[PDB]
Amino acid sequence: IINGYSSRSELVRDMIREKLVEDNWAEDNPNDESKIAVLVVIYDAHQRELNQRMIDIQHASGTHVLCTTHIHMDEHNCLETIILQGNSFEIQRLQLEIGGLRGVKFAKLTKASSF
Amino acid sequence: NDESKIAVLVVIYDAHQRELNQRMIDIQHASGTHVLCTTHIHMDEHNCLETIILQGNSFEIQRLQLEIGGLRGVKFAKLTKA
Amino acid sequence: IINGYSSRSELVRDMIREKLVEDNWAEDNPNDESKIAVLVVIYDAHQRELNQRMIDIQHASGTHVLCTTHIHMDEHNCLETIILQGNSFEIQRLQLEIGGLRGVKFAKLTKASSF
Amino acid sequence: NDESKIAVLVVIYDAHQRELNQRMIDIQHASGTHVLCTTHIHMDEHNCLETIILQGNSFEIQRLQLEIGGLRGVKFAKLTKA
Numbered sequence A, C: 001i002i003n004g005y006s007s008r009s010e011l012v013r014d015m016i017r018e019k020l021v022e023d024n025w026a027e028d029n030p031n032d033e034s035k036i037a038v039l040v041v042i043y044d045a046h047q048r049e050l051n052q053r054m055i056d057i058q059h060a061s062g063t064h065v066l067c068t069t070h071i072h073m074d075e076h077n078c079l080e081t082i083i084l085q086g087n088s089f090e091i092q093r094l095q096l097e098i099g100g101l102r103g104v105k106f107a108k109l110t111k112a113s114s115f
Numbered sequence B, D: 001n002d003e004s005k006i007a008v009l010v011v012i013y014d015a016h017q018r019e020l021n022q023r024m025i026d027i028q029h030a031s032g033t034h035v036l037c038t039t040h041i042h043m044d045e046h047n048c049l050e051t052i053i054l055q056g057n058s059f060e061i062q063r064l065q066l067e068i069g070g071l072r073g074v075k076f077a078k079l080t081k082a
């Protein structure tokens, strides 16, 4: 528990929450298109063509990208939170395509469900 | 290692719990430069999603995650670290 | 020109751009629901009930609010850019309802059209 | 009056002009703490909208608006001041 959680049943509640959202994604109509996720990306701020490729990829997915918020971290690094909505397949496709771009140093998905 | 780092806290919360978002905001304002910004999607009548971008050493980031994630009405609060 | 624009035809280009987006909003099918706008709001960070009311108002408009990005300016002030998509009427209704909340100090609309 | 202020620069630009967004990003990174964050909506196949939140005195804010608004491929660039 000591990054230091506060008590006994505090690390476990946090686990049941992302267990329950993770069980949601597994057994829910593969083809349900309202699921939403956050893709967190850190990338080289001056990799030729990288930003344009990421834009192109997001625009070709269209309806599946709600917005992106970008932080200029420093001279070398940008962080983006890209908010996605679609089925599991469309969301994983997008994560993988952005993850496989030269200059992307980090591309991690957080799955979010409605309650 | 007491190094400043960026992190994203993803929260889903009940769009109707009174005082919840006022509490979330008080915490973030009282944290000053450790919150960079928040983005919010109104997912449906009962749920809001926020991505809250944070900046600090891992102990400061942790204290923030605890404080926001422990609020009544918060259904999900998961942290991603640089 | 001196906030200081650079030359002669530089202040005027900037005027033709928001003339042309402003002429767009005036004579385009009142009922076209794809128009998008940015509502910029500055508000009292600790006005009882203000944030909840703003959320309620945005959730009741639903599909018409794409996202909001919030900056905690200081102890007393928050800024938000609320991105809206709808017809002119839905967008103006929303601006007015947020503008008439106790604690909102500033609520200005920027209309954005596709080219 | 040489006071730091917040401002929002709303930009619409061509989602296909090569080098445009790399230029926009270079300017913002080279401006350091005068850019707080950007939010981007992919409006359609040919247009992106960004809200770029800035911080600085009115001369610094102006220099930024000029630099970003003058880029080829930028179709609209309008500033809102606190």
Ligand code: NI
Pocket (backbone or CB within 6 Å): A045, A070, A071, A072, A073, A077, A078, A079, D025, D029
């Ligand atoms: Ni950047």
Ligand code: NI
Pocket (backbone or CB within 6 Å): B015, B040, B041, B042, B043, B047, B048, B049, C055, C059
């Ligand atoms: Ni909401």
Ligand code: NI
Pocket (backbone or CB within 6 Å): B025, B029, C045, C070, C071, C072, C073, C077, C078, C079
């Ligand atoms: Ni705030």
Ligand code: NI
Pocket (backbone or CB within 6 Å): A055, A059, D015, D040, D041, D042, D043, D047, D048, D049
């Ligand atoms: Ni775009």
